[PDB]
Amino acid sequence: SGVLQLGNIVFKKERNTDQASMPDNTAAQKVSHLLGINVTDFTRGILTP
Amino acid sequence: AQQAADKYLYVDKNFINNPLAQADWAAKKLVWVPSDKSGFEPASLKEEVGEEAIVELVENGKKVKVNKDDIQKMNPPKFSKVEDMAELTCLNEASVLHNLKERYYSGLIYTYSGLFCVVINPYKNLPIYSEEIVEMYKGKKRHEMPPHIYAITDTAYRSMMQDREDQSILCTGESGAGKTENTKKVIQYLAYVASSHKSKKDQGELERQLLQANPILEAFGNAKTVKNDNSSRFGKFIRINFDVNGYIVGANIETYLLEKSRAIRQAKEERTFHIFYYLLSGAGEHLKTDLLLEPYNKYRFLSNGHVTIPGQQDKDMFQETMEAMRIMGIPEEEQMGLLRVISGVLQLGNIVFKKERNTDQASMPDNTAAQKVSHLLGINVTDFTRGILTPRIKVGRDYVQKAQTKEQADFAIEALAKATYERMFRWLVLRINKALDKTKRQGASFIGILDIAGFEIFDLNSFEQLCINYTNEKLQQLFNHTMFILEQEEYQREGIEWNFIDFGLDLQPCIDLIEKPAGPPGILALLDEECWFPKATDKSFVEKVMQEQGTHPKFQKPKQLKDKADFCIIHYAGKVDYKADEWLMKNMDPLNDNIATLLHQSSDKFVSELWKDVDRIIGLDQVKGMFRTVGQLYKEQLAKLMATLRNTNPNFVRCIIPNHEKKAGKLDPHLVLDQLRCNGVLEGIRICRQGFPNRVVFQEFRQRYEILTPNSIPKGFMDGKQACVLMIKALELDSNLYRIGQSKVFFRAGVLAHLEEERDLKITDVIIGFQACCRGYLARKAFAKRQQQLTAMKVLQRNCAAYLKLRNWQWWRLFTKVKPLLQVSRQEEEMMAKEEELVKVREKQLAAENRLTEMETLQSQLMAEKLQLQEQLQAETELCAEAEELRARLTAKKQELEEICHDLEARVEEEEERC
Amino acid sequence: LQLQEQLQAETELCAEAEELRARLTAKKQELEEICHDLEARVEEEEERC
Ligand SMILES: Nc1ncnc2c1ncn2[C@@H]1O[C@H](COP(=O)(O)OP(=O)(O)O)[C@@H](O)[C@H]1O
Ligand SMILES: [Mg+2]
C-alpha cells in the first residue's frame, strides 16, 4: 500500500523557479504513515535533499 | 545573580498598560530634537507654520526654532525600557537611542530588535552570567525571559533542533564592542546546556576543553592595541557539532587574518601578542635560564618596552595559560616547544648587521644572537648565516647566488620572525582542532560562532586594517542582504502580494572596489597583479589605483595631503586612509628558500613540524600560480567562510561600543547613533514591524498548534494547507496578522509568540491533569497498602495471640513436649534439608547454564567483530602496498621528466649559441 | 582492541601514503607542464631560425 501511495504524490513546477513544489501533501502523509516515517522529514528529503 | 536580576535583567513591562503614562505625554506634547552638545535633546512643541517649528527644551527651558523634518516623536513614558524596539509604536532614531541609553545607564546591556539583538559594552564585571544558566535561561524561549546572549544561544539551539537547519551566531561591531566576550558566553552556554542534559555523562571532558580553547588562542594572538586591551588580531569561526539528540560531538576552530606584523612592530602605547609578555613576566628563573630570556629593553621587537595592562598580572596569566594547555592535553614537550619558538622569535629580534665600510654587502658583528637562535630553534649558526647572508637558488639549467645588503638581511630576519610565529599559531590552532574534533564523523548538525576582528580605525592604517575592514564590510553586507533582500525575496517567492521596500543599505559598490577581479579591477585584485614586475613600487601601486579606481564614488583623494603614498576609502562605519608602506612585500610575503629549508631541516622536531609543507615556499625575493598572494589567500578563505554562512540561519548580535574612552557608564550618544545608522539597526527593526518575520510550514504549523484547535480538523488525512486554513479560521486570527503562501504561513511580529504562549498554557493544563491522575493513582496504592496492613492483621494477630495464650496454658503444652520425641518431625526436617540443598544446587545449575549461554553468544559476536576488523586491516595494508608501487613508478617517471626538461633547456642554449 | 588499533595505524599510514602521492603527482604535473612549455618554445625557435 505504501508503494501504491508513492506516485500518488504530485509535484508542481514552481511558477517562478526551476524547483519542485508539492502543493498537496495528503499522499505524502499516507506514505509516511504506512512506511513509518515523519511527513516533514520525508518532504524535505525529497524536495531538497 | 538571580537576586541582582531586578537591576540588570528584568523590567516592569506592565507599565506599558499604564493609561496616565500616555495621558501625561499627550498633555506635554514631548518631542525629540537634534543637538551639538555631545547629547541629544528633549522638547515640548509650541509653534508651527509651513515647514517650520519652535520647541521648548525640557531640561533648559530655552526655546529654539526647529525644522519639521527634525522633530521625532517621543514614545510615551508607557514604553520606557521596552525589551524589543519592534514593540515600539513611534519607531524613530531618537526613541531607539533613548531606550538603549536608559537601559544601559540602568545596567541592562542586551536589547532585542526584531529578529536580532543589540548589546552595548558595560566595561564592568556585571553579575549577569553565572547563575542564569541553571534555571533562568535553560530552555526558556525568547518571550519567557529578558534579552540575553543566553536567550540568543538557546533560541539558536532550539531552532537548530526544531527546524533541522544549521545555525550561525554572528557578533558585529568595531573594536571594543563585545564580540570576543559574547562569543565566550555563547560557548559557555552551549557547553553548560549540552553537558547538563547528558544525565549519565554530564560535566564531560570535551565541555571542559572547549572552555580552555579560547584562553589559549587569546594568550597567543590577542594584544593590547590603542583601542582594546585584549585586541583579537585574528578572526575566528568556531563550529560546535551536535548529534540528533542535541549533545555536542565535536568542535572546530578556523582562524583568519592573523596579524604577523604585531610580533615585529607596535605603535607608541601598544603591546605585542600577550604570550611574549606572559613568558617574560616572572615565569621562573630556571625557565629564563633554559629559554635564554632577557629584560624587555634588549629586544628590537618589544617596541617601547615593558608596557602593562590594568587589573591582570602577567605572572598569573602565564600559569593560567599553562593550566589551559594542560586541560587541552598539550604535552609538556609541545608546550615547551611553543615557549622555545617564542624565545627564538625574540632572539631573532636581537640579530644585527655591521654596516660594512668597504661595500654595501655586510655580516654580523656578533654571532651570539645567532647562537641563541641555534640553541632554541635547532639550526646551526654556520648554515643559518650562509643561508641568510648568501642564499643560493637553482633555476633550470643553472645555479644562481647573490649577496644580501643589510636591509635585505633585516627583511629576511623579519620575514622569518613573522612566518615563524604565524606557523606556530597555525600549528596551535591545528592542535586545538585535533583535540576537539574527537569524532571521526561529523555531527547531525552544528552551530557556527563567528568572531571577526572588529572594524579598525587608526592614524597608522595599513594592508592589515584594509583586509579587516573589507571583512567587516562583507559581513555588514551579509546582514543587509539577509534582513532586506532575502526577506523580501521570500515574500515574492511565496506569493504574498508584498510591495518591495528600498532601505538604501547596499554595500556592493565598495565591496567591488576592493575585491572585484575583472571589469574595473579592485584594489586588492589590482596589486595582486602588480607585485610581480621588477619595476613595481608601492608609489606606483598608488598611481595605478588612482588611475584604475580613483574615479570610484567610494574612493577618495587623501584626506590630509594628496602627494603622499596614501589610499582613502569610504566604508559603512567610517572613512579610512591607508599608507602603502611595504605593501609589495606584505601582499607577496616572500621567504628565503635556503633558510626556510634549513628551518624545515632543523635538529628540533617541533620547529621541523612548524616548517612542514615548506616545498611550496616562494623562489625569489622582491622580484606565479604555484605561489599565492596573501590577497588571494584571504579572498579565497573569506569566500569559503561566506559560502558557509549563507548555508546557515544567521543569528546576528550587534555589538556597540558606547564610548572610545573605555569608561563604564559613559555614552557618547553621537557615537552610538553613528553605530546605529551604519549598522542598519532601525532598518532591521522596520522590516521586522512592516514585514512578516515569522514563517511556519503548513504541516509543522498543524503538528505544533493543533493542540489549540483540536475539534477543528476532521480526523482523516488532509492537505496541510487546508488544515492550516481551518486552524487559522478556528483561531480567529485577524486577516492582517497572517498571510498564507505556497508552502508557509506568514505571521506578523508577536503573533506566533502569542500562539506559543497559548500552547504552553494548553500543555500546562494537560500536564496538570496528568499529575492529578498520577497523584490519584499513588493515593490508590497508599489506600491499598493501608487496607492490607489493617484488615489482615486485625484477624490474624488476634487469632495467633489467642492461641499463644491458650496453647501454653492448656494440655496442648504436652504435645509440645511430645514433639521433640517424635521421629516423623525429624524425617520431615531431613527431607526438607535434602530439598533445600537440592534447590540451591538446582538454582546454581540453571543460573550457570544461562550465564554460559549468554557469555558464549558474547564470545561468538566478539569473534565476528575480530574477523571484520582483521579483514579491513588486510584491505588497508594491501592498499598501502599498492600506493607504494604507485609511488615508485611516479618517482621514476618524475626523474625521467626532470632529465628530459634539462636536456630541452640544454638544446635551447645550444640552438641559441649556434645561431 | 588490538585489531582496532592496528586498523587505526594502517589507515593512518595509508592516508599519509595517499597524501604523499598527491604531492608527487602535483609536482610531476608542474614539471611535465614546464617541460612541455620548453618543448613547444624550442620547436617555435627551431621554426624561427
Ligand atoms: N559582556 C561583557 N562583560 C564584561 N566585560 C565586557 C563585556 N563586553 C566587553 N567587556 C570589556 O570590554 C573589553 C572589550 O570587549 P572585547 O569583546 O574584548 O572586544 P571585541 O568585541 O573587539 O573583541 C573586554 O575585554 C572587557 O574588558
Ligand atoms: Mg575582538
UniProtKB/Swiss-Prot annotation, chain B:
Residues 1-822 are annotated as: Mediates interaction with LIMCH1. Changing K794N: In a breast cancer sample; somatic mutation. Keywords: Acetylation, Actin-binding, Alport syndrome, ATP-binding, Calmodulin-binding, Cataract, Cell adhesion, Cell membrane, Cell shape, Coiled coil, Cytoplasm, Cytoplasmic vesicle, Cytoskeleton, Deafness, Disease variant, Host cell receptor for virus entry, Membrane, Methylation, Motor protein, Myosin, Non-syndromic deafness, Nucleotide-binding, Phosphoprotein, Receptor, Ubl conjugation. Residues 26-76 form the Myosin N-terminal SH3-like domain. One of its GO terms (molecular function) is RNA binding. In the kidney, expressed in the glomeruli. Also expressed in leukocytes. It comes from the Eukaryota. ISGylated. Residues 638-660 are annotated as: Actin-binding. The keyword ATP-binding applies. GO terms for biological process: actin cytoskeleton organization; actin filament-based movement; actomyosin structure organization; angiogenesis; blood vessel endothelial cell migration; cortical granule exocytosis; cytokinetic process; endodermal cell differentiation. The modification N-acetylalanine is found at A1. It is found in: Cytoplasm, Cytoskeleton; Cytoplasm, Cell cortex; Cytoplasmic vesicle, Secretory vesicle, Cortical granule; Cell membrane. GO terms for cellular component: actin cytoskeleton; actomyosin; actomyosin contractile ring; adherens junction; brush border; cell leading edge; cell surface; cleavage furrow. The modification Phosphotyrosine is found at Y10, Y738. Residues 80-760 form the Myosin motor domain. Residues 763-792 form the IQ domain. ATP binds at G173, E174, S175, G176, A177, G178, K179, T180. The modification N6-acetyllysine is found at K7, K101, K298, K434, K612, K844. Cellular myosin that appears to play a role in cytokinesis, cell shape, and specialized functions such as secretion and capping. Required for cortical actin clearance prior to oocyte exocytosis. Promotes cell motility in conjunction with S100A4. During cell spreading, plays an important role in cytoskeleton reorganization, focal contact formation (in the margins but not the central part of spreading cells), and lamellipodial retraction; this function is mechanically antagonized by MYH10. (Microbial infection) Acts as a receptor for herpes simplex virus 1/HHV-1 envelope glycoprotein B. Belongs to the TRAFAC class myosin-kinesin ATPase superfamily. Myosin family. The rodlike tail sequence is highly repetitive, showing cycles of a 28-residue repeat pattern composed of 4 heptapeptides, characteristic for alpha-helical coiled coils. Myosin is a hexameric protein that consists of 2 heavy chain subunits (MHC), 2 alkali light chain subunits (MLC) and 2 regulatory light chain subunits (MLC-2). Interacts with RASIP1. Interacts with DDR1. Interacts with PDLIM2. Interacts with SVIL. Interacts with HTRA3. Interacts with Myo7a. Interacts with CFAP95. Interacts with LIMCH1; independently of the integration of MYH9 into the myosin complex. Interacts with RAB3A. Interacts with ZBED4. Interacts with S100A4; this interaction increases cell motility. (Microbial infection) Interacts with herpes simplex virus 1/HHV-1 envelope glycoprotein B. It is linked to Macrothrombocytopenia and granulocyte inclusions with or without nephritis or sensorineural hearing loss: An autosomal dominant disorder characterized by thrombocytopenia, giant platelets and Dohle body-like inclusions in peripheral blood leukocytes with variable ultrastructural appearance. Some affected individuals lack leukocyte inclusion bodies on classic staining of peripheral blood smears. Alport syndrome-like features of nephritis, hearing loss, and eye abnormalities are present in some patients. This is Myosin-9. The chain holds residues 2 to 931 of 1960 of the full protein.
